[PDB]
Structures are given as structure tokens and as C-alpha cells.
Paper text:
The enzyme, in complex with either UTP, at 2.0-Å resolution, or UTP plus the non-hydrolyzable ATP analog AMP-PCP and the glutamine analog 5-oxo-L-norleucine (3.5 Å), is a homotetramer with crystallographic 222 symmetry, consistent with previous studies reporting positive cooperativity for ATP and UTP due to nucleotide-driven tetramerization. In contrast, in the independent crystal form, grown in the presence of AMP-PCP as well as UTP and the glutamine analog 6-diazo-5-oxo-L-norleucine (L-DON), AMP-PCP lies in the ATP-binding site, as expected, with UTP maintaining the same orientation as above. In agreement with similar observations made on E. coli PyrG (Endrizzi et al., 2004), a putative ammonia diffusion channel was visualized connecting the glutaminase active site in the C-terminal domain to the synthetase site at the N-terminal domain. Moreover, this mutation should have a destabilizing effect on the P loop and on its proper positioning within the ATP-binding cleft, leading to a decreased affinity for ATP.
The combined data indicate that 7947882 and 7904688 are prodrugs activated by the EthA monooxygenase, which then target PyrG, a cytidine triphosphate (CTP) synthetase catalyzing the ATP-dependent amination of uridine triphosphate (UTP) to form the essential pyrimidine nucleotide CTP.
Numbering used by the authors:
A (entry chain B), B (entry chain B), C (entry chain A): 7 to 429, 443 to 553
């Protein structure tokens, strides 16, 4: 049948969890054998999130095709176990620059270029593009489009109008509206309130959209009497009124939605091929999530100590590495600035079982990350470095063999030894192939000598320093196919059981149901270190 | 005191006449000795109206500084008798491209770039820029900002939010909101309806704006009982409820607003220096408008026969030329396509007293305009050619002396004689100086040999053909100061009493209270032709 | 099938003609063989319109069962040719007093009595009651419910909410929403505007109602391009976008709606039994409306004659009387106060062909109505008196025979001769039987001696004065079955060709397709007077 469009909107307030609810619905539909693709509409004017501070706004996700996207695409890829195109993230910035650029070229042939229909046609074009056959030739069954911003706000109006037009042009049989609302609890009276959902749905209806179902985000179960009140006042089928209480883990959200039979309601309402959910893969994940056999502590040596969306894909990849070993990864958020000195690094990393040095696109404090690697090497702690992490492993190795002032030309342009430098240079974005040295730590982890990983960097290992850096025992165990670019570094296992660096972001290809081989090997080495210390 | 901001919004429906009401208020405040400047906020995405078809969307106005703007700037200049900057026209296209370009350069330093505050800050910046001292050093007393689009529509939301923020930041003492509404008449019941104004004001209030006054656009006088109902339901001072019935001429609108004492209400509400209106100049204009001593028929040989906004400044300049002679100019709208043949041109121009060949930026049908000039020359009819008009006078002169296939390379790239060609070339926009031949028709009209006029063209008279074209008797009576570019052409008065062409758009510098010298001389020649035919 | 509910709402402004559009649709569906009943929901607090000044708010219609209702019930009866129950008019006043009375008796059993659901349940009950089998045992096919007030106003909110709940409970298959909007014309630009319809439909959608069709009230045909714009922006089937221009006569509206195929769209959308319209009866009416063979002038001697709805059923009955004779009745609206003196009555009634003295519930000036009858008797003008009219005929007869101070005790309680008096008394409402004198003017008009007419009065002919009044020649040609109450009066044809009075309101039983026998005889006598004057 025709590709179906399922729009996810939000009401009352932001940060209710629309993205994770949409992803969980995507997981449930995928588990029913449906081909699901997902898309995020971001009402911000940044053409891409590359200009945003990730320490304030969250990580930048990078797709296989090299697009810098909102972190939500990461949630979609993790719940669908699918590579999404750069088209899966639409911003107001992209839409307006595209339309204005076409206007300047005279492509609208003398027309007054307007929000309606020219801006809404562009958004609609980007929504409908998701229903085109992919590279393998497959057309999706369902396109889940998450509409960023809140209903009733100015910024979301062109997106919501485009979604209303998609419904008008494709008909009610091919389009479904899911609206996420808040049911707050008032502690003095002890009651849940439906009034915000009532008003939010009236604002949604006022812009021409009739919700087919409602996600009632709450800190508790929404009683049947409240669901009945909402069904009546909002004119939503009672089977489409979904009590969605805060879940203990993000992996529990599909079970919350399935208990309320939201996915079965969606399949019936869109007249999609029906098949029962195959719970094999997700039940296996939930056993690894809720029933670990051991705990392991990993230091994430980033900008700060607060649990951060700036390292979301890294944190998820670490946990997934744990799941593979039926282990619980406890992340010790360590501020890199505190690891600069040997006593500072000892106080911060003395009780961990592994040290992860993550990526740091646009950051400035590097001496703390180098300090953490120097401590971990001496302590015998496993190390996994990602992009900036590999660069810090390379800088620390060069300094350990006499190049005292070795650095990246990015962080010290006046360094006499730029062991990390541009090839200014070439920004490497998206998937790049690498060839691994057979029997190396990285080749043993991947169980192959030919791999591909996603990149986001313009600084590379300076090849003029390979022989000098190798004096530390560090091996260039992975390179580009022509051998010019260093892609992976590692110490021999007889010197350090696990010290590995990668120029790429393997965390982006990690899934909770498909852990990344490097994170599996890293967590495995951390479990080994813990057992050796007992 | 502080520069005041007066915002003009529209409700119920578009095309009510907001621009002319704002201009008329601008005239009334100017006549009270206040320094008034005006600005139009256009919600369209066209960075400038240059890509719009003027035959569908109206003429492009060109300012002294060379900006291509909405025709509304023309209304402002005509009612204020002032040159306005390119900043007097803000479009959504300009705002979004400026903000997106700053975002791409990293000027927002890691911020999420949003409609609020980044888009609204840019609009607010453009509104507040109008309050800066001009080139002569003068700061305006009042900035009248017309908000395009209708209240309740999506496209106007960022502009209205910016205006609300201007009020918030400057205070109620420095900001005034004027809302234009429709009071429709229902013929079966014979009654006027206030309900649309009631609902429009509630929509305006819902976005945070309280109107200080209301323009009640109607086909009849709004009775006191209806004004009282509106004052009460909309909470507007009865002195700010303005009955604005459709006026016989646009020049009558200041008298309609003054009778209702809107300008006195505005001056008192904004605590502006009070002075009575000096009616000397406007009463003089109204006597020329309503009490002409003679009538004269002028053919406007444009694309079509319907009264058009595509030639608004030309039509206004023709009427102003008439006012100077205490004459009524009757415009005979003649489709150029019908003047290609000698019999067609005779049928179309046989009963007129003058022929105006207007500008035609982006048009295709030129043979009809050349045909009209050939007929007018043989008939002894006065001719005034503007931009394309001069080019058509030059082409017709070249063909009359044997260059049968003479043309502009714009309309016939394969012409063996490109008498009009690029210097591709250089687009000339805005004010350019010209030096006139003393005792020429053009120098006698201007009463000076040094002039400046506004341009909008890239094709010029090909200097290689000057000697050949002059064989017709045509004189290059005006040039650029270095003598390289032809700016004016004319025939000797002994051959044709008035056949003049200009590369510029003198109509743009015309005002109803200050007619342009070329239009005064042209209409004067048309009055002479009429009298000679009696 | 199930009884269908068709709701008629209004937007933009009041007095657009919702009632006549609904009635015309009722006529079209009746002509397709459907059993249609109609109901008006009035948002005013008057329990019945009896306390309203009819000279400000329009006539009070009286049903067979004696309910005093809004004049709209009259339009319904005239277009359906059916007697409607008192239940066909619901007011806010009725609903709130019913619910408050139930609350005071404890019928809500400890509940908080609320607008939702208690007021809306009462309105819904009154809407659904219209679908119950009538006295003959027949259940209607369609109930057309007109919702008074304008969408977006406070007063209509409970009615609109009840209609939304009827849709929710019965489903989309049994409920249809028709929304009436205004398409205004802007004379300076010459354009029709769709913006008010766009905004009105968004307000209707915001309160939970999706219109199935739109009535576009306009002073001209709405072009296809504007209908296409509305279909797209309002998301209404193009087949349901109805151009409804101002019609020359109210009886032309069914043809306007049929041309746009609204009735066929309604029948298909509600899955009603389909049958073609039988145009026999209505085409016959339209020939009498548009092709009269003669014109006749009738004075309507009302207390206050603005040309208002205060005498709507009288004016319609006069026209229907004309139709029967293939004549056009021109109503000369005459203020009764000007007919008090014989010279005043001569100036006012000198050029008419008949004099109608209508009912005057709540009036104070009766001397002018008596003066008009005295003039008409002397002039030989036909007279038809309704309720107060009969009473004035009786008072004038008594005074013409020497009872100089004869009057009604209603207008002069101190009269020594109350020829009109109570039995205080008994208010007679609705249908009452009368027995007519065989071979009397009234029996010859009705062509029967047994009739029934609707009443609205408490004053009667004082039987103690029958012998004295009869001295004038006046006959008591119609009485109650027991002979106690005077129902009809007339002069013998050998004294006056046509001077008739009735205590009732025969105009209420008049239909354009079924003229009332008294109005047929009256207009016939007026045609005779005109012919005798030539
Ligand atoms: N059902 C649920 N229970 C608990 N936490 C939840 C949740 N749904 C979402 N979250 C939390 O919300 C966080 C942010 O993701 P979310 O889905 O809320 O984005 P969003 O759509 O509301 C905002 P934006 O569009 O700016 O990205 C997740 O990291 C997760 O921890
Ligand atoms: N009071 C009035 N009486 C008669 N005509 C009037 C009028 N006010 C305006 N008009 C007419 O309206 C025409 C268009 O100018 P107007 O002021 O209506 O623009 P606007 O602000 O409504 C639309 P936009 O923003 O797209 O330019 C004028 O050419 C004039 O003839
Ligand atoms: N198509 C049409 N052509 C001409 N006149 C029309 C018309 N439709 C309605 N009218 C006129 O409009 C007036 C108001 O009609 P109507 O009673 O139906 O309006 P309404 O329903 O808005 C008032 P209420 O609020 O009292 O119910 C009447 O004088 C009627 O004759
Ligand atoms: O009327 C409005 C208000 C706000 N916005 C948009 O809201 C966006 C901010 O998105 P948020 O959801 O964070 O709103 P908030 O900060 O105002 O309130 P909190 O829930 O965070 O406490 C901004 O990007 C702005 O464009 C509108 O579009 N319209
Ligand atoms: O909800 C809406 C509808 C329309 N619009 C905006 O209205 C603009 C069109 O401006 P108009 O005033 O011409 O509206 P219209 O054509 O829809 O109706 P008419 O009055 O002309 O009959 C378009 O440029 C669009 O962006 C909104 O911003 N929001
Ligand atoms: O927002 C509002 C305004 C008014 N009303 C209600 O409107 C009713 C008056 O109804 P009208 O339609 O007569 O309004 P109006 O007189 O103000 O304007 P026009 O006729 O000129 O169009 C009153 O009974 C009042 O309660 C609302 O319910 N809500
Ligand atoms: C990828 C990473 O962690 C840092 C990127 C840095 N700016 C670069 O190496 O180019
Ligand atoms: C100015 C005018 O009328 C036409 C401009 C034309 N395109 C040109 O000469 O460049
Ligand atoms: C019936 C009428 O209109 C006036 C008569 C008066 N109210 C009465 O007889 O009670
Ligand atoms: Mg999200
Ligand atoms: Mg304007
Ligand atoms: Mg009605």
C-alpha cells in the first residue's frame, strides 16, 4: 500500500520526550515487520547544528552520508537499527535558505514568494522525499515525522501547516497525527490535571489538525476516568488515549506504549499490514538492561562532571558494550580540567576500571585529556580514545619519547612539533573506509581487517612524526586504504592490555541491540581490569 | 523628545488601504511641522521585489540610494515629499537571509538561532534603524511602520512580535498602534457590521498588542452608535475610533482623517509637540484635483488597457503634470501590442493629445511601442519616453534613416544594428547625474543644465551609432558628466514640438505637490496640441 | 435510515441570511421527498420573545400549539409548508431556567451543575427531541438546526458545544455541518476577499467543528478561483463550497442553492435516499413572483414602520395574496400616528388600493389606526384588520353610531364604553376554532363555514355592545363554536365591498405556495378598487 505518514507533535511544554516516544513507536512498528523511516523537523534557523555549542544544546549526530544533524537522528537510528539519510533532519534554516536561493535565481518566475504556499511546499517536499525508494530500492511502509517546537508557538507554524497539507493531499487513510501532552500532578491536592491536554488539543485543532491519538506524559499512571474525560473533551478514540508514565530506562518506553496498545491502534487506523510484535530482540536487551550479572565503572573524561547529552551516543555505546557482556556500565563523569596534574588525575580516575577520552569538536581544554591518558597508561587502565581521543593518545606518546612540546596545531599553533595537523586542510565528514593491520588489537575487536566509520574532523596525524611516535611502542594499526591517513592507533597488548584510539566516531554506529565492536572490547578490557584488581 | 514609533496593522482582510491611510497620516503630521519618516514591512520572501512580475504585483519603486522596493515607498515619498532610504522596505527574505548568513559565519557564538529572539531582534533592529539621524543630521520625530499582511495570518507573526517588543522596550509613551479594519455593508438588511472589527482586535490583543486607534474602512460613514459599540467592545478611546469611508481621490484621505481628528489624537497620545496643520500646500493640491480648468487625454502605451499599479508612479506623475497647468489628465490605457501596425496605432492613438512610452523592465513586446512613436511623430503628437521609452525613440530614429533591422540587443540579440546594447554590462540603479545641452528642450523644461535622476537598467545607447541616429535630427541633449552615457534624447522643436526620451525614471521623483519638470513640459505640450487641433 | 442532523452555523458577522439559506435547503430536501423538520437555537435569555419590542427585534411567531417563538419558525413553516411545534425554538433562557429549576429540586442528586455537561445535555436533549415521531407517527429524515449567534462569540458557545457532542455521539454519517460566511467586496481595488471565511472556519474548527460545506454570502457570484482557494485553505470539499449571491427575491434562494448542487451534496454526504427535486410547485411560485400581470399598492398602517421585520408574516401574506392573482403587491409602509386626522389619513392613504391594519402587541397609539379605518370606509378602500385591527374596526363602528368615547379598556381604562374588554382575562394563544355565518364575506373567502386560526390576545369584543355596534351595519360573521367570542367582523358588501376584521393572525398560516383565503380576498378587493379608479 501507499507509504503512510505519522506526524508527532507536542503540546503544553517542551522536553516531554516526544523524540523517544516516536522512536519507541518506530521500534514497535519495526518489530511488526514494517519498514519504518524517521525524520525530525527542527524549527531553529541554524542550517545545520554545527554552529551550536554541544555543551549547551547536545551532541551533533553524523550520518553515513556526512550530514551534521540534531541528536534526535541518533535516537531514531538506535531504535530502528537503520542508517538514516541527511534528509532525516529538516531545519527552518535549510527551508528558508533553499526557498530564498531559488527566488534569487528567478525559479519562481515572477511570483511573490510567500510562507504559504512556497515555504510550506518546501517543507512538504522534504516530508514526502522520505517516502521515496532508498538506495537498496525499498520504499518505507511508514515515515514518522517528529515536529519540533510546541503547538501554539510561532516557530512551529510553517511545519504544522505543511503537515496539515500532507493530510489534505494524501487523505485521512494515509496520514496519522500523534500529539504528546503533559498531565501534571498537583501535590497539595494530590490530583492529576487534564486541562492542559484539553487546551493543547484545541490549539492543535485551531490550526487544522485533528489528533488521532494522544500521548499523556505523566510521572504516574493516568487513571481510566481521566483518559475517559480526555477522550470525550478532545474527541479522541479512547483506544488512542495513551497513559505514558516516566519509565525507569529509555528501553522500557516500547513496553509502556505496547501495554496501552498504541502500535496496534496505529496499524489498524492506517490500515497497515498487521503482524504481532516479535519481542525476541527487545526482551533480550531488557534482560541485559534490568538483570546485569556485574557492574563496571568507566570514566568519561569530557568537559564536565554532569550527565550530558553532549556525549549521548558515547554514553549509549558504553552501556551497549556493557549489555554484550551482561554488565552494567556505571559512567563516572570526570571533568578533563581536573586531570591535568598527576594528583588530580589520580583523585579523579583512581577508582575506575576504564578511561574513555571522547571527541571534542570545537573544545579548548586538552591538557586534562592528555593527563588522563598519561595516568591510565601508568595505572594499567584500559583507554578508548575517539577522534580528539586518538589525537591525545598520539600527543601523549610523542611527549613520552622526548617531544616535550608536541601538540596539535589546532590547540597550540606555535608548537615546534605539530604531531597532529591539517593535510586549512580537508574536513572529513561521514563514512570513510579503513584497513586494519591483521592480528592488531583493533582487527581482533572488529574480527575483520576492512571497516568503515563516521568522521567529523579536519586535523590528522602528521605522517612526518610516525617513526618518532612509534618509539613509544604505539602502532598505527589502522589507516585509509591508500595508507596516507592514520585511522586507528593502539599499544601492543604486552605493554598495555587495551589502549586504543580512532579518528572516527564509532559510537554513532552503535545500537543497544547491536553494540559496536570497539566498545565491546573496551568494556571487556574494563571487566578484566576490575577482576585483576580483586 | 524621543523618536516615536507608530505601527500600522491590518485586520479582517487585505487591500483595505493601510498604506494610503498611513501616508495620509504622515502628510498630516508633516503639515504640523513634524519630521516624519516611513517604513514598510513586507512579509514576502523575495529579498527585493525585482524578481516579481510588475504586471501582477505592481511597479518596483527605486530609491535615491538604488534599492528596489515595494511600490508603497512611492506612496510614502509622494505624501511626505521626502527621499526615503533603502531601509524603508524590510522583507521577510531580507531578515531571514541576514540572520542565516550571520549564523553560518558563527556570529551567534554557539547559540541555537531562533525566531524569538534572533529573527525578532533583526526586525526590531531594522525598525529602530529608522530612528537614527539622517545624512543631513536630522533625527525623525515619528517613524510610521506599516506592517504588511493581515493580523491572524502566519506570515505577519514575526513582524507583529517585533512591534510588540518595540512597545515593551520603549514604553507606551513612545509607541502607538493603529489598526485598520473593515466595516462591511449587508445590502439585504441595509446594515453595517462591527463584528469583524471586534474579532480582529481580539486577535491583535491575543498576540500582545493593544490598539490605540482604529481605522474603520467602509463604503459609507460609520454612525456614532457603531463607533460607540466598537469603542466599548474593543476598549479603544472613542476619539481613536476613526470612520474612514472610501474617498473620491487618494488626496482626499488626509481631510477624511483630519475631520475625525486622528492626527490630533496621535499627537496628544504620543505627547508630541503640538502645532496646527498648515493646509496651504494640500488645499492648493485639492483645488487642482477637484477644480481643473481643462481636460487633456494622454495615452499610456504599456502592456495592457486596464488601469495599472504596474505604472502607478507614471500615472501619478502624469496627473501631477496636469495639476501644475490646472488641467485634468485623462489616461487612455493603450495596449502596446495593438500599435505595431499603422492602422492599429491610428485606431488606438487618433483621439489622444500626447503619447507616453513607459519603462518596461523585464517585458518582451517592443514593436508596438516603436509603432506608437512612429505614429506620434507623423501625427505631430507630443512624446515622452521613460527608460525603454528612450530606447524605443532611439530604435525608431535609427530605422527611419535606413537601419531597417535596428534594435536593442535585449529584444533581438541577432540584430545587425544593436543601437541599444550593454556597456553583461553594468546595472545602473538609483540616482545618477546628467549634464544637459543648454537651450535644449530638456534643459528648458528643467530650467537647469545639471540634473540627477533615478535609474533601473543595464542597456545603453550604443555610442558607435550616435552619428547615424543623429541623421534623423534626434539630439543627444543629455549625457553622463564624462559624456560617455546618453541620458536624454529629443527632436528639435522645429521638427517635433515635443519628442523627449530619458534613460531614467523621473516619475519616481514626482510628487503631487511638486510635479516633475519633464511631466509638466510633456502635459503642457499635450495642452498645446489639443488647442491647435481646435 | 437514522434521522440525520444538519447544523447551520454563521461566521464573520450576523444577519447574513442563515435562516433563509437553511429554509431554502429545507425546501429543496422536502421537494426531493424527504421529511424535513427545522429548529432554531436562539442565544438570547428571553424565555420566549414575548418580552421583546417587536419594532426593534422583529415579530413574534405563534405556532398551532400556542408557543411564542422567534420569527425564524415562520420562515421554516413558509418554506416547508408544515406546522412546526413549539419545540422548534430553543432559547438560552429556556435551557438555563429548565436546568436551574431541576437543580433547585435536587434532580442532579448532589452534582455540581455545570455548563458542560448539564447545560449542553439539556440543549442536546432539545436537539435530539426533534428526531422523535410526530403526532401522525412519522419520524423525520432530516432535522435542520439553525444555531443563532456568530461563531467566535460567547453567547453561542454552549449551543456549538452541544452540536459538537451530537456529532460525537451520532457519528459523521448522521451529522452535517453547514457554515455561513461573508465574502466582502472592496470597491477601490475591485476584489472579493476570502480571508474572513478562512479565519471564521479556523474559529469553528477551534471549538471542535469541521464544516462539511460553506455558504459564501456575497453581493456577486464567487469566482471558481476564490472557491478553490477556500476549499484548500478551509479543507472543505470543493463540491461543498457554495457561491450564494444576494438574490432578487427570497423565493430565488432554493434555485441559487440547487444551481450550486448543495442539496445533492447534502443528500450524498448524509447517505440519504436520493430522488430528483420536483420543481412543479416552486416553478409556479417563481412565475407569479417574477412575471406579475399587474401591480397593486397596499398600505400597512403600523404603529412603527421602518420597513422592518415587525410585520414580516403580514408582508409575506400580502405578497402571497398577490401571487394568487398573478399580481405584485407594493407595500406602502404608513405610520399610524399620521392617520389620526382625516387630512393626515388622506395624505398617507390617498394613492393606495387597500388598507391593512395589523396586530399591535404592546403599542400605545391606536387613534391613528381608527383614523385610517374611518378614511378607508369613506374612500371606499378595502380594509383587512388583524387582531388589534378587528378591535379598531369595532371601536370605529361604535364611534360612527354615537358612542363617541368608545374604546378598548386596554388603551383607555376610563372609557365609559369599553366595546373591547377582557373576558385580567384569558390570554388566547395558538389555534382556536371559529364558525362562520354562511354566505358572509369571510365564509365566501374561506369557501367553508368552519375554520381555525392562531391567536395572541387577551382582549375581546364586549358582547354587551353587539346590538349598538351592529347599528353601523357591522356583522359578527365569525364566532367561537359556542357563539360567545367574536372571531370575525365584516360590513355587508352593499355598504363596503371589503371591510373585514379577525381576532386572529391568519398571516401565520399563509405560505407563498398556499396563500391565506383572507389575504387572497383582500388583495382581490384591492385589485378591484384599482380597476374602478382607472
Ligand atoms: N518516557 C520517558 N521516560 C523517561 N525519560 C524520558 C522519556 N521520554 C523521554 N525521556 C528523556 O528525554 C530526554 C530527551 O529526549 P526527548 O525525546 O524528550 O526530546 P524532545 O522531542 O522532547 C526535545 P527536542 O525536539 O529539542 O530534541 C531523553 O534523553 C530521555 O532521558
Ligand atoms: N481611503 C481610500 N479610498 C479609496 N481608495 C483607497 C483608499 N485607501 C486606499 N485606496 C486604494 O488602495 C490602493 C492600494 O493601496 P493600499 O494602501 O490599499 O495597500 P495595502 O496596505 O492595503 C496592500 P500591500 O501591503 O500589499 O501594498 C490605492 O492605489 C488606492 O487607490
Ligand atoms: N440569498 C439572499 N438574497 C437576498 N436576501 C437574503 C438572502 N439570504 C438572506 N437574505 C435576507 O437576509 C436577512 C436576514 O436573513 P436571516 O433571518 O436568515 O438571517 P440570520 O439567520 O443571520 C438572523 P437571526 O440571527 O435573527 O437568525 C433577511 O432580510 C433576508 O431576506
Ligand atoms: O509565542 C512564542 C513563544 C516562543 N516561541 C519559540 O519558543 C522557542 C523556545 O522553546 P521552549 O520550549 O524552550 O520555550 P521557552 O524557553 O520559552 O519555555 P520553557 O518551556 O523552556 O520554559 C523559541 O525558539 C521561540 O521561537 C514561539 O515560537 N512563539
Ligand atoms: O493562515 C494563513 C493564511 C494565509 N497566510 C498568508 O496570506 C498571504 C496571502 O495574502 P492575502 O491577504 O491575499 O490572503 P488570501 O489570498 O488568502 O485571501 P484574499 O483576502 O486575497 O481573498 C500568503 O502570503 C500567506 O503566507 C498566512 O500567513 N496564514
Ligand atoms: O465576543 C463577543 C461579543 C459579543 N457577544 C454577543 O453578541 C451579541 C450581539 O450580537 P450582534 O451580532 O448584533 O453584534 P454587534 O451588535 O456587536 O455587531 P454587528 O451587529 O454590527 O455585527 C450580544 O448578545 C453579546 O452577548 C458575544 O457573545 N461575544
Ligand atoms: C573529532 C574531534 O573530537 C575533534 C575534531 C577537531 N576539531 C579536529 O580534529 O579537526
Ligand atoms: C528601464 C526600462 O524601461 C527597461 C530596462 C531594460 N531591461 C534595460 O534597458 O536594461
Ligand atoms: C393582537 C394584537 O396584536 C393586539 C391586541 C392586544 N394585545 C390584546 O387584544 O390583548
Ligand atoms: Mg526529540
Ligand atoms: Mg500599503
Ligand atoms: Mg434565522
Amino acid at each position: 500500500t501507499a507509504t503512510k505518514h505519522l506526524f508527532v507533535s507536542g503540546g503544553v511544554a517542551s522536553s516531554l520526550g516526544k523524540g523517544l516516544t516516536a522512536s519507541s513507536l518506530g521500534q514497535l512498528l519495526t518489530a511488526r515487520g514494517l519498514h519504518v523511516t524517521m525524520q525530525k523537523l527542527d524549527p531553529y534557523l541554524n542550517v545545520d547544528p554545527g554552529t551550536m555549542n554541544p555543551f549547551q544544546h547536545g551532541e551533533v549526530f553524523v550520518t553515513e552520508d556526512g550530514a551534521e544533524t540534531d541528536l534526535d537522528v541518533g535516537h531514531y537510528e538506535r531504535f530502528l537499527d537503520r542508517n538514516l539519510p541527511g534528509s532525516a533532519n529538516v531545519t527552518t534554516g535549510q527551508v528558508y535558505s533553499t526557498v530564498i536561493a531559488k527566488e534569487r535565481r528567478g525559479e519562481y518566475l515572477g511570483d511573490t514568494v510567500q510562507v504559504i504556499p512556497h515555504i510550506t511546499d518546501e517543507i512538504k517536499r522534504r516530508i514526502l522525499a522520505m517516502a521515496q525508494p532508498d538506495a537498496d530500492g525499498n520504499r518505507p511502509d511508514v515515515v514518522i515525522t517528529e515536529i519540533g517546537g510546541t503547538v501554539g508557538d510561532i516557530e512551529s507554524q510553517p511545519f504544522l501547516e505543511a503537515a496539515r497539507q500532507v493530510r489534505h493531499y494524501l487523505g485521512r487513510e494515509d496520514v496519522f497525527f500523534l500529539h504528546v501532552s503533559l498531565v501534571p500532578y498537583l501535590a497539595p491536592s494530590g490530583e492529576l490535571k487534564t486541562k492542559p491536554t484539553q487546551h493543547s488539543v484545541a490549539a492543535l485543532r485551531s490550526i487544522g489538525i485533528t489528533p488521532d491519538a494522544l500521548i499523556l506524559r505523566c510521572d504516574r499512571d493516568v487513571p481510566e476516568a481521566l483518559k475517559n474525560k480526555i477522550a470525550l473533551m478532545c474527541d479522541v478514540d479512547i483506544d488512542g488515549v495513551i497513559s505514558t508514565p516516566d519509565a525507569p530506562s529509555i528501553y522500557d518506553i516500547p513496553k509502556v506504549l505496547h501495554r496501552e496498545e498504541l502500535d496496534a491502534f496505529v496499524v489498524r487506523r492506517l490500515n497497515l499490514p498487521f503482524r504481532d510484535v516479535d519481542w525476541t530482540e527487545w526482551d533480550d536487551l531488557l534482560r541485559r538492561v534490568h538483570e546485569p550479572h556485574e557492574t563496571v565503572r568507566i570514566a568519561l573524561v569530557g568537559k564536565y562532571v554532569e550527565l550530558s547529552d553532549a556525549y549521548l551516543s558515547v554514553a549509549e555505546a558504553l552501556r551497549a558494550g556493557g549489555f554484550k557482556h551482561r554488565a552494567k556500565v556505571e559512567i563516572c563523569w570526570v571533568a578533563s580540567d581536573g586531570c591535568e596534574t598527576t594528583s588530580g588525575a589520580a583523585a579523579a580516575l583512581g577508582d575506575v576500571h576504564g578511561v574513555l577520552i571522547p571527541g571534542g569538536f570545537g573544545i579548548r581544554g586538552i591538557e586534562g585529556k592528555i593527563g588522563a591518558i598519561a595516568y591510565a597508561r601508568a595505572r594499567g587502565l584500559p583507554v578508548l580514545g575517539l577522534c580528539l581521543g586518538l589525537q591525545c593518545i598520539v600527543i601523549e606518546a610523542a611527549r613520552s619519547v622526548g617531544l616535550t612540546n608536541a601538540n596539535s596545531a589546532e590547540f597550540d599553533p606555535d608548537t615546534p612539533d605539530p604531531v597532529i595537523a591539517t593535510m586549512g586542510g580537508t574536513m572529513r565528514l561521514g563514512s570513510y573506509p579503513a584497513v586494519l593491520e591483521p592480528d592488531s588489537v583493533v582487527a581482533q575487536a572488529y574480527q575483520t581487517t576492512q571497516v568503515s566509520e563516521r568522521h567529523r574532523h579536519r586535523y590528522e596525524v602528521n605522517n612526518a612524526y610516525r617513526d618518532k611516535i612509534a618509539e613509544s611502542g604505539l602502532r598505527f594499526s589502522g589507516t585509509s586504504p591508500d595508507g596516507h591517513l592514520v585511522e586507528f592507533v593502539e599499544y601492543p597488548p604486552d605493554r598495555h592490555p587495551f589502549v586504543v584510539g580512532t579518528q572516527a566516531h564509532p559510537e554513532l554506529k552503535s545500537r543497544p541491540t547491536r553494540p559496536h565492536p570497539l566498545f565491546v572490547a573496551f568494556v571487556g578490557a574494563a571487566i578484566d581490569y576490575k577482576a585483576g584488581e580483586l
